[PDB]
A paper describes a structure:
Here, we reveal a unique mechanism by which the Legionella effector PieF perturbs host mRNA decay by targeting the human CCR4–NOT deadenylase complex. High-resolution cryo-electron microscopy structures and biochemical analyses reveal that PieF binds with nanomolar affinity to the NOT7 and NOT8 catalytic subunits of CCR4–NOT, obstructing RNA access and displacing a catalytic Mg²⁺ ion from the active site.
The high quality of the density map enabled us to build a complete NOT1 MIF4G domain (residues E1093–S1317). The principal interface between PieF and NOT7 is primarily formed by a section of PieF’s β5 strand (residues S101–F103) and several adjacent residues (K96–G100) immediately preceding it.
Author numbering:
A (entry chain A): 1 to 18, 26 to 125
B (entry chain B): 1093 to 1317
C (entry chain C): 10 to 263
Write the structure that this text describes.
Amino acid sequence: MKRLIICNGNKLTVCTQAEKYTPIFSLTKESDNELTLELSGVARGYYIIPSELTSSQARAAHLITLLTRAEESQTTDMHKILNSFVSGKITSGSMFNFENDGSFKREPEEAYNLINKI
Amino acid sequence: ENIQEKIAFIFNNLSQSNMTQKVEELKETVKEEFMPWVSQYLVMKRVSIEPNFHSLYSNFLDTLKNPEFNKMVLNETYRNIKVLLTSDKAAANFSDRSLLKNLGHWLGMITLAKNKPILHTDLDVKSLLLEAYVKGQQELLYVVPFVAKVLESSIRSVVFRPPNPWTMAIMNVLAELHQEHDLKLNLKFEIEVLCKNLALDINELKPGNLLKDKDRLKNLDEQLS
Amino acid sequence: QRICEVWACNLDEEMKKIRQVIRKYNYVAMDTEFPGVVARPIGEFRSNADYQYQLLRCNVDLLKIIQLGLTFMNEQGEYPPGTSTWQFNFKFNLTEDMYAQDSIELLTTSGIQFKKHEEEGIETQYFAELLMTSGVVLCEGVKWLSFHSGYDFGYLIKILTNSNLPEEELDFFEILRLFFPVIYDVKYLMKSCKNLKGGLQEVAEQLELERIGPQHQAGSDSLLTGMAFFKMREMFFEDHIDDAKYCGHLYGLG
Ligand SMILES: [Mg+2]
């Protein structure tokens, strides 16, 4: 069961497979710097966010941990995309494909052609 | 000597209107043998003492369209700059300090503004700033205004615009100098003006620790004297 | 020592040698190593050559270069005595950086020491400052040879401009012709060369070239590109390459 992240400008949407995908949450970058978390339909009745986390980026990184079942102290490839979007490193419309463990989707054949320049 | 009075006549009445006509006047008057004399005359007798007529002569070079003459002018500019850098830096030589500013302004216009680099083997700008700092306070009066005039043309270059890695290499060295409590206010004000000319913020620059590495300022290649 | 491995400690000492080589040996064969491709653009594109730039733009802006190899030759295809290739090893953390695992696995097998890169690697901003005034870029008379260099020149432009790639492919090439006025892509030239197909290693067996150095590393791959160009130019192009037909064209881009 793979995952997907779309960065369409000021919004980062996290979706899960269902090759249709259903959004889980979206992290909107508001006017000055504010991030807004908007959970999808069946997300508030599924995931519980502890009151210790307050910032919208902390609950976004907590939901990715719940999604990918990563350890408490980890940064998956899904967290790296979240950390890059929040710091504004993703400035173009791009999609990121992930495995169930949060790492980038494995493409053995494409990597072979890149180093070999085939 | 008759030809000598005709090269001076060509540059004496130059303007944007007759620039194309006077470019042809030079070609039929000065042969290939006398070309090195014209580059020496242009830099020493016109460029060095006339800062207002610098875009006039830069446009003359573009209109002339002679790559061999452009290399002679660039070589003569470096030769004249190094004569002033390796000289006696007296505190009363107000004129010699103005020649370096005019030659620095000319150098940036014909290299940086034309999307061309100032080659390291020709003039190493960053080590010039570091060497002048450790040599003394009179060597900074020659170099900081000279460097500020060279970097003025970086804003008019799509390559050397401030986001350039090499431009902020120089601008971060000047940010370290601006932080010194010994640098005089007349040199601090010149760095502030250069930041405003490049649409930069002196507070947003990133000064390093280049001025505290004494073991690196000892083996600097010497361009001053 | 045909290939010199350049780290942060000897970058300035090896730049002195490079600044004198470029005067006599003005042909620069080059290659880069990068952590792969992880992003795909959104939307519909009017051409396949426009999707390739947006795919190139999406990944260069996010990932960072690992290696760069520079080989210097003259018009006759001859090398400087001693060292002709320089391998620049840049800073790269395998924990804090984004990469494709199939690329890191394929680069580890080649022999890339990713722990040395993290601790003793070069900063790309300091390298670009040194390379700007060396005479290798922005200077007339220098010819750049490459092989399928859409990604290779995107990473070079990224560090040379210290900003993101232009949103339009027109502006990417406008700033490309300034730093690199002449570019020869050997893979693009192979389309007019009879029976030459494949990758760098595949094509450097029809030309019968013997590789020097470890495979899939920037220094040895750039050296192989230089021998590929001058051998292919000797059989198929009659020791002359048209500048109005092959210069500036990158494979896939355009
Ligand atoms: Mg390679």
